[PDB]
């Protein structure tokens, strides 16, 4: 580990300092489907002719990014993403732009969203939830080790590859920070107390979000939910969590410490770092080395019926990709 992370720091740092650019053109890919849509962009399942491969292509509307004041976050996304590398992170093969858009061609994850599965299914057996947690756990070890705060963990963001493992996506809020940060962002239900209570915060929030994930993977629902955001933030800062009947003793334990409002007592931001997580009772059955090597027994193999199959993703009204005759946000994105 220690020996490993270092090597990884030098690798990341090298890519981070001289990040790639214009590694392809739109007209090199073939549009196929819209795997997801939102705020200022959409992600399509695309085919790359020259090699016949598939990739998901995140498309960002430069002007829609400027309006939502996300210029700085979009630059972080591409920069961090091309510089990073880990067994549970989507590879960013290509990235480019044109008069109207920003493009990030990622590796296709035929498995679909965790979210999609956890909802249809309902909840996950602790052995199944724990399998995923662990992965998110290491990934967070990797990320943090590089002075990186993910800031937007949520089922809607964890994909499942053929082997049945996690593929963290969406680095829209990923940021390389040493020390406190104030940027208020993320998804409500997973917001850390600090973040809502506008008091500056650090990685400690990536562990709180983690505890939230696990809870939702093992219970079927979030420990903090309601019909409107205010309501929810009010539940998080309240410091009152309620666990189901079927949550083992150990689990209720690990969760209590992660959903800790007191960040001088929150598992992860402590003196022993991430080992307080790797060495917890609820995790004893876990062989962290086996996981890193994708040699564990995937508790759920999402199967697809053929390359390009997309029966694991929901449907979205296909839209058009139009690029104005004029550059749109030149210097605002000059380094993408």
């Amino acid at each position: 580990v220690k020996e490993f992370l270092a090597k990884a720091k030098e690798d990341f740092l090298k890519k981070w300092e001289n990040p790639a650019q214009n590694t392809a053109h739109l007209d090199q890919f073939e549009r196929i489907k819209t795997l997801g849509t939102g705020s200022f962009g959409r992600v399509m399942l695309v085919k790359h002719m020259e090699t016949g491969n598939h990739y998901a292509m995140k498309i960002l509307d430069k002007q829609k990014v400027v309006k939502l004041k996300q210029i700085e976050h979009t630059l972080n996304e591409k920069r961090i993403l091309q510089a990073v590398n880990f067994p549970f992170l989507v590879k960013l093969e290509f990235s480019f732009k044109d008069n109207s858009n920003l493009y990030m061609v990622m590796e296709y994850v035929p498995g679909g969203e965790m979210f999609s599965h956890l909802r249809r299914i309902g909840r996950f057996s602790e052995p199944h939830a724990r399998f995923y947690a662990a992965q998110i756990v290491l990934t967070f070890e990797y990320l943090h080790s590089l002075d990186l705060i993910y800031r937007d963990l949520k089922p809607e963001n964890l994909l499942i590859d053929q082997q049945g493992y996690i593929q963290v996506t969406d680095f829209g809020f990923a940021k390389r920070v040493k020390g406190r940060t104030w940027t208020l962002c993320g998804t409500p239900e997973y917001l850390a107390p600090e973040i809502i209570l506008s008091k500056g915060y650090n990685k400690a929030v990536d562990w709180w979000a983690l505890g939230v994930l696990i809870y939702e993977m093992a219970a079927g629902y979030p420990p903090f939910f309601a019909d409107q955001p205010i309501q929810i933030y009010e539940k998080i800062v309240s410091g009152k969590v309620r666990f189901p009947s079927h949550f083992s003793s150990d689990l209720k334990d690990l969760l209590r410490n992660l959903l800790q409002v007191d960040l001088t007592k929150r598992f992860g931001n402590l003196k022993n770092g991430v080992n307080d997580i790797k060495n917890h009772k609820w995790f004893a059955t876990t062989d962290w080395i086996a996981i890193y090597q994708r040699k564990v027994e995937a508790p759920f193999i999402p199967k697809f019926k053929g390359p390009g199959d997309t029966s694991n993703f929901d449907d979205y009204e296909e839209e058009e990709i139009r690029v104005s005759i004029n550059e749109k946000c030149g210097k605002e994105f000059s380094e993408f």
């Binding site: 979210f115 208020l184 962002c185 239900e189 309601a226 955001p229 189901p244």
Partner: peptide
Amino acid sequence: TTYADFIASGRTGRRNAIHD
């Protein structure tokens, strides 16, 4: 049941992230 309350709630879909 909590699980029941959850499904009647309009937060059981893909949850969007908060910006500004």
